[PDB]
Amino acid sequence: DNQFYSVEVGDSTFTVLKRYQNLKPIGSGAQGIVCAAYDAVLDRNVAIKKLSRPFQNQTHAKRAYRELVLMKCVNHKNIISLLNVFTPQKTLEEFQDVYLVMELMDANLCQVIQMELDHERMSYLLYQMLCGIKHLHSAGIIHRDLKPSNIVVKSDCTLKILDFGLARTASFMMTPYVVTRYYRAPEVILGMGYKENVDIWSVGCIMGEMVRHKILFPGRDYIDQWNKVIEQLGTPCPEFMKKLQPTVRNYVENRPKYAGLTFPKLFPDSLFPADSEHNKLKASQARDLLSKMLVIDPAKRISVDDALQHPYINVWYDPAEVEAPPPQLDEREHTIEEWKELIYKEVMN
Ligand SMILES: Cc1cc(NC(=O)c2cccc(-n3cc(NC(=O)Nc4ccccc4)cn3)c2)ccn1
């Protein structure tokens, strides 16, 4: 009779459709808790994320709504695709939670970064991240907040990006969670204005960490983080400074000057499989790509198309996956009641 059932999953109550069985916790985040499950209807394993009262505040609401909308605008093997969306609640008045269902993956990219990976695996993960970012850019979506915790992989080395990044407008959270900012581009750190290659910096940060096994640009907030960028890469050129707002420009120019380390110093041969001649050349190509991605000035940073054509990446190139047909737009402040209805009607398509 009742098409739903409830189970306790570490404090959280998961009320799901009876087709989803044997729920087990797999992940946590600000926006929701994630379970693995067996889908008896599709006869396959799935991941179920629970969004609890996503209309409770502006931050959760914009993100929940934006991502329910954008998932219908996108169709690419390297981007999250939903198998199902549902709410156990019967009316708008009763509405509390949203459950999102996707293919069950095997790991988060944080786990993969901790491993020693050959150049075949690393170049393939990067190629897929670039394909996913290319597809998002073609659909008018510049991410600006790509990070490993929002990227998932399968044992076969296949990869998917799980989110759509930053709102095209903007904020406060009572939740004790902290937003990971270490992969953000200088144009985001310094509130500059950006183009598609803002996402290249984030790929560079991920690639760098895969090699170094340490976050490249850590820090308590943007102050410490900027210090890390300039100490390693060196103070940017005068041409860069001109594009900064006058107040951020003053702070940036009055920071201590740094020459910055060269890329062989930043990423020595020790960090690379560089035993065979094949590995020696791939190590040289990997460092070359990193030197083109970790570039402070976006005017001098490599583009998505040029990174895809890079010798380190182009061995995976296939036209069927580099280009997919790219096909209304919300940018408004709303009350709890407004967001609850906007979300509910997206859920009830
Ligand atoms: C064969 C097998 C594999 C596993 N998998 C894991 O242990 C694992 C580990 C880390 C991440 C993931 N994973 C995380 C998602 N989705 C989301 O995080 N977020 C998300 C969900 C739904 C919609 C929108 C967004 C997908 N898989 C799985 C467990 C048991 N057996």
From Swiss-Prot:
Post-translational modification, as annotated: Dually phosphorylated on Thr-175 and Tyr-177 by MAP2K4 and MAP2K7, which activates the enzyme. MAP2K7 shows a strong preference for Thr-175 while MAP2K4 phosphorylates Tyr-177 preferentially. Weakly autophosphorylated on threonine and tyrosine residues in vitro. Palmitoylation regulates subcellular location and axonal development.
Enzyme class per UniProt: transferase
GO biological process, one term: protein phosphorylation
Keyword Nuclease tagged: no
Assigned EC number: 2.7.11.24
Keyword terms, alphabetized: ATP-binding, Biological rhythms, Chromosomal rearrangement, Cytoplasm, Epilepsy, Intellectual disability, Kinase, Lipoprotein, Membrane, Mitochondrion, Nucleotide-binding, Nucleus, Palmitate, Phosphoprotein, Serine/threonine-protein kinase, Transferase
GO cellular component: cytoplasm; cytosol; mitochondrion; nucleoplasm; nucleus; plasma membrane
GO molecular function annotation: ATP binding; JUN kinase activity; MAP kinase kinase activity; protein serine kinase activity
Annotated localization: Cytoplasm; Membrane; Nucleus; Mitochondrion
Record-annotated active site: D145
Main location: cytoplasm
Residue positions where Phosphotyrosine is found in the record: Y177
Record domain Protein kinase: where: 20-313
Binding site for ATP: I26, G27, S28, G29, A30, Q31, G32, I33, V34, K49
Membrane topology note: Lipid-anchor
Motif TXY: positions: 175-177
Catalytic activity entry: L-seryl-[protein] + ATP = O-phospho-L-seryl-[protein] + ADP + H(+); L-threonyl-[protein] + ATP = O-phospho-L-threonyl-[protein] + ADP + H(+)
Pathological condition linked to this protein in its record: A chromosomal aberration involving MAPK10 has been found in a single patient with pharmacoresistant epileptic encephalopathy. Translocation t(Y;4)(q11.2;q21) which causes MAPK10 truncation.
Subunit structure: Interacts with MAPKBP1. Interacts with MAPK8IP1/JIP-1 and MAPK8IP3/JIP-3/JSAP1. Interacts with SPAG9/MAPK8IP4/JIP4. Interacts with HDAC9. Interacts with ARRB2; the interaction enhances MAPK10 activation by MAP3K5. Interacts with SARM1. Interacts with JUND; interaction is inhibited in the presence of MEN1.
Name of this protein: Mitogen-activated protein kinase 10
Organism in which the protein naturally occurs: Homo sapiens (Human)
Gene designation per UniProt: MAPK10
Shown chain mapped onto the complete sequence: 45 to 400 of 464
